[PDB]
Amino acid sequence: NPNYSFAGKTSSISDLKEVPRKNITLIRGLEVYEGQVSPSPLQVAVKTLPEVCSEQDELDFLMEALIISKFNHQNIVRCIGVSLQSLPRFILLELMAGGDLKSFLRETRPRPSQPSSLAMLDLLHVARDIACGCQYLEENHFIHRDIAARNCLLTCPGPGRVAKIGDFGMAQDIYCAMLPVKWMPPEAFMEGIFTSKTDTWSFGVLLWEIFSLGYMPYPSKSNQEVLEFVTSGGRMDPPKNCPGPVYRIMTQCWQHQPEDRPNFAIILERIEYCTQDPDVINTALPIEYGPL
């Protein structure tokens, strides 16, 4: 019966909104499923706990539910509720029909078949959306410890999409071959120290992911190669066609000392300035060659 504290308030399993299992219908796989909760039922994403799981997996599933349920921000995926009293156990989330941001960027790259699928403003809007969520976490003293394109989701694929932070596993914090080293600042991988300025660093890496249209950070480098590179002052080059003003946000996010990195209010200010600049937003994204 673990307690969870966020923004000075403590909650437990009893605070989670239990939805009767009979009101929940699974529609398709997306494990995660599209579902409906009951003339116009609510469309949801359903995250499931495998019945064949360990006891730690059970506790981790509960904690995930507690964490997400206590956030209240338009750029953090909503929790509709849970169904923990039937098996397999469910967490019911906001349906994000656009899927994860990394997959979206890769699949929606400008190609000859789709020459204007995305523009710079689309990318700056995604960046602003996630920075807004990050500012909310910072203001509420929550350290994400796992900001990355794979952990962000889109409301829909088409125009008007809103990006949100969707996953809260805190993968960077060991307090390893699964460690997301490519998103971690020096103090995190060396000393295991995390603060809101460690989220700033990771946001810089996300910005690179966005403006590269979904490339893996540090092209051709392994995890240890990246660790040694970043420790010695090495930084990524700009993504292809990346405007100078946008690259400078990245390089500010990657200052060696945490105190020299911007907070999320400043990041948002800088993203807004880029969004206003015609030379930035009139920059064409590269076209990835393919058939008509």
Swiss-Prot record:
Q: What is known of its domains?
A: The EGF-like region drives the cytokine specificity for ALKAL2. The heparin-binding region binds heparin glycosaminoglycan. Heparin-binding is required for ALKAL2-driven activation.
| Limits of the Protein kinase domain | 24-280
Q: Which residues carry this modification: Phosphotyrosine?
A: Y4, Y33, Y175
Protein's name in the database:
ALK tyrosine kinase receptor
Record organism: Homo sapiens (Human)
Please describe, based on the UniProt annotation, the reported consequence of changing I147T.
Answer: In NBLST3; somatic mutation
Q: Which disease is it linked to?
A: A chromosomal aberration involving ALK is found in a form of non-Hodgkin lymphoma. Translocation t(2;5)(p23;q35) with NPM1. The resulting chimeric NPM1-ALK protein homodimerize and the kinase becomes constitutively activated. The constitutively active fusion proteins are responsible for 5-10% of non-Hodgkin lymphomas.
What residues does ATP bind to? K47, E94, L95, M96, D167
Placed within the complete protein, the shown segment runs: 1093 to 1404 of 1620
Tell me the gene name: ALK
- Protein localization: Cell membrane
Q: What is the effect of changing F71V?
A: In NBLST3; somatic mutation; constitutively activated; retained in the endoplasmic reticulum and Golgi compartments
What the entry says about post-translational processing? Phosphorylated at tyrosine residues by autocatalysis, which activates kinase activity. In cells not stimulated by a ligand, receptor protein tyrosine phosphatase beta and zeta complex (PTPRB/PTPRZ1) dephosphorylates ALK at the sites in ALK that are undergoing autophosphorylation through autoactivation. N-glycosylated.
Active-site residues from the entry:
D146 (proton acceptor)
